[PDB]
Amino acid sequence: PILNKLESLNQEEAISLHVPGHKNMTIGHLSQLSMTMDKTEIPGLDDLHHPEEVILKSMKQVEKHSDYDGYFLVNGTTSGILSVIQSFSQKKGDILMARNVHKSVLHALDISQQEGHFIETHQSPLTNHYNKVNLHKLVVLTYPNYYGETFNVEEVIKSLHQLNIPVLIDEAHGAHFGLQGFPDSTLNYQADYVVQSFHKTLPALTMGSVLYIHKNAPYRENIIEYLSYFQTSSPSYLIMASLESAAQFYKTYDSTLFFAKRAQLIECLENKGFEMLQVDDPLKLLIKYEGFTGHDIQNWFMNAHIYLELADDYQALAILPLWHHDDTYLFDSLLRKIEDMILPKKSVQLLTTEGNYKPKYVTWCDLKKAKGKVLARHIVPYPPGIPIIFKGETITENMIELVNEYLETGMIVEGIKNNKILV
Amino acid sequence: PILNKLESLNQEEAISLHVPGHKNMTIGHLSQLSMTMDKTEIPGLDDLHHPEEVILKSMKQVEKHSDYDGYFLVNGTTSGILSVIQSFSQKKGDILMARNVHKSVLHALDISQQEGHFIETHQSPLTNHYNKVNLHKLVVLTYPNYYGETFNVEEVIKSLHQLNIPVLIDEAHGAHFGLQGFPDSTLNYQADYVVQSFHKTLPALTMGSVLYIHKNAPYRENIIEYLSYFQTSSPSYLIMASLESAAQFYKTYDSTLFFAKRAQLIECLENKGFEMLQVDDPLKLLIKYEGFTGHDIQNWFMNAHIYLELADDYQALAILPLWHHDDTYLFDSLLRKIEDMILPKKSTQLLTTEGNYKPKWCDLKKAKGKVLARHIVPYPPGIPIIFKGETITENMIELVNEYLETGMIVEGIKNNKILV
Ligand SMILES: *Cc1c(COP(=O)(O)O)cnc(C)c1O
Ligand SMILES: *Cc1c(COP(=O)(O)O)cnc(C)c1O
Ligand SMILES: [Sm+3]
Ligand SMILES: [Sm+3]
Ligand SMILES: [Sm+3]
Ligand SMILES: [Sm+3]
Ligand SMILES: [Sm+3]
Ligand SMILES: [Sm+3]
Ligand SMILES: [Sm+3]
């Protein structure tokens, strides 16, 4: 079944504007890999969880900044994130968190049983999504957010260090950061831990990621040991080789061709009546169309066998390829598919406050009576279909008000049934 | 450098007798895959963490037994082991363990902070490794051991269920079990959880495994949820595709040719003067040569560009290919290489006792009552006899001192001290 669908997508010549960043083997040099290289810890090849030969030499090549050591991840940024946070489990204090931390961070606090606390987290006026925080054993921040928006993370990092708190930057969507024309990575701002999902925006295979640890960061050794707990003992050499290939691609990339093709794409879309929101990251294209939803726009592109990354009620997200001179991306077919598209005629508040998290039988309780209690299931308003209140939080006056405001306006709200909340 | 090595292995026609089970893409049908198919949760493809379409349908085809639901694992059997154990964390009692449990089991107790206890575990007179247990919220057993040795596991599972204890069976080396002429899987013995590393002995890609959860098993929905915690949010469709392929390979496999080719290889090996230990699983071949070590053997084989799985002092282990009529394996070259090899002329009592585990340098003589902080690993055979988190006893000290008395290399020991 899976193979049958994958073959069918191949025959329809599907065009990727989605993860991973090799774009159905059109961007990058992964054509140099082959499955015959899917091997194991035989002498001559090294051992990821004990690297002292060809993998360590490769690790020295994945380096982007001289204050950091890099480590290969085969179980995604997820595994980096589990390994950094687990190392704090026996230390006093709690873990501070933006409201747009990835679920992996909440999974880490749950399985390790650690106290948490959400930082005041604010909404973009552009994207309607979380995009910045305002200020105790660790801080976790997402940078960029999913939609490629940045904020003054450097200053936050400095501020937290003056209080002696280390920071973990979830840089899942900033693996391409540092290339000419793009935003800067947090590797430049003395972040203690920075995990990047190579596979999401670079030509690495799905699941490939890298954890960068600052050479002075707390619990370095423990963290390195947990990477060998949270990743299989049988790590993939295909994935590892793709990290290596993708790192070489990052090292020698020239972006001039990208910025030209990007301009052409926007031209083409705009002449079709689409409206794009320019975020800080040029790789992330947000497409709107007056009178219609992102899901509608997602569907329209799919009907042309072009596959976007995701959508919300407001807009759809294209993650652009890292186009280069020798790529096999179907650029002309992309632009030609957009031109001939037949579109219709055109027509037509997140929780920001701080909060405690506890890593904790359940029951539905009336909102009015749920105050002071621990939430047992996420509240997810549509739009934007991401959580405003996570399970583990203590329910407040303010939360109930905003949640009733949602319901009064007829906004779909998951984690609520019959005007009750799970506790 | 990683690629350069991988390429030079291909340029020297490396012959695999190691994991994974596609054997340098000579065994199986993974030539139907392409890295063009390395995609994501776009519409049409499903979602491994919330499967209700193509991946759910594929799970149904992964079924080996109607009493179980199979779940794809892209982070190995490891992720499966972590998911099962985590679910018992808030429940009272300890996790009972064979002394040859894999490191992920101890990792799991450590991350989840659960009490453990080791079961009496015996040493094989054949392999001199741990091969069998002798009899409380959960029991974790390894079946088969990685040398392909089995034991009366059915009988142990029945005794435990009568004491109302569920069992997790680490079947990492039993993915090919149930095939004609091979031992049977614990899926037949009502085991509550069975984890199989498809990639190790079937033609699936490295990292691809399957967790089978009995439909009555304790904490089913919690375990299924934790699968989405311990695995990446971006699971590889290549790996999933490879498990789907490996399943179809299992179900359609005819092993008549395997046993013919196995016998011809043993014939060839015997004629060179190698001594082969016959273990319960036909897929595992244990090679000896009188006067020399398993390491020596592995070297001699590497010099012929034949790669064995691993070795200890006693023996070198070969994991055989699941040969078939349309495979592309270099069988003649293997025999040729063995034939014309130029070989020289011919020329550890493990701790079996039960013991408690706590998820938490001292003279060995003064160590009784302290909790071990680093594994004690005798060479040979180079696997732990006493694990970090165990309480040191008079008998452990006696045993370990006799190790040292006799010139046996012991890791975890420095200046006759142990780490506490
Ligand atoms: C995808 C993602 C992750 C997780 O990385 P994987 O490589 O999918 O494990 C973490 N944080 C954010 C913001 C992500 O988008
Ligand atoms: C390899 C192995 C594992 C782990 O499985 P992976 O697929 O490598 O994660 C667990 N138990 C035993 C006995 C093993 O040999
Ligand atoms: Sm607190
Ligand atoms: Sm404020
Ligand atoms: Sm207008
Ligand atoms: Sm000859
Ligand atoms: Sm005594
Ligand atoms: Sm005694
Ligand atoms: Sm003596």
Coordinates of N, CA and C and ligand atoms in Angstrom, one line a residue, chain B residues 335-341, ligand 6:
Chain B
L335 N 32.3 -18.8 -1.3 CA 32.9 -20.1 -1.3 C 34.3 -20.1 -1.8
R336 N 34.5 -19.4 -3.0 CA 35.8 -19.3 -3.6 C 36.8 -18.7 -2.6
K337 N 36.4 -17.6 -2.0 CA 37.2 -16.9 -1.0 C 37.5 -17.7 0.2
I338 N 36.6 -18.5 0.7 CA 36.8 -19.4 1.8 C 37.8 -20.5 1.4
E339 N 37.5 -21.1 0.2 CA 38.4 -22.2 -0.3 C 39.8 -21.8 -0.3
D340 N 40.2 -20.7 -1.0 CA 41.6 -20.3 -1.2 C 42.2 -19.5 0.0
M341 N 41.5 -19.4 1.1 CA 42.1 -18.8 2.3 C 43.3 -19.6 2.8
Ligands
SM6 SM 41.2 -22.0 -5.1

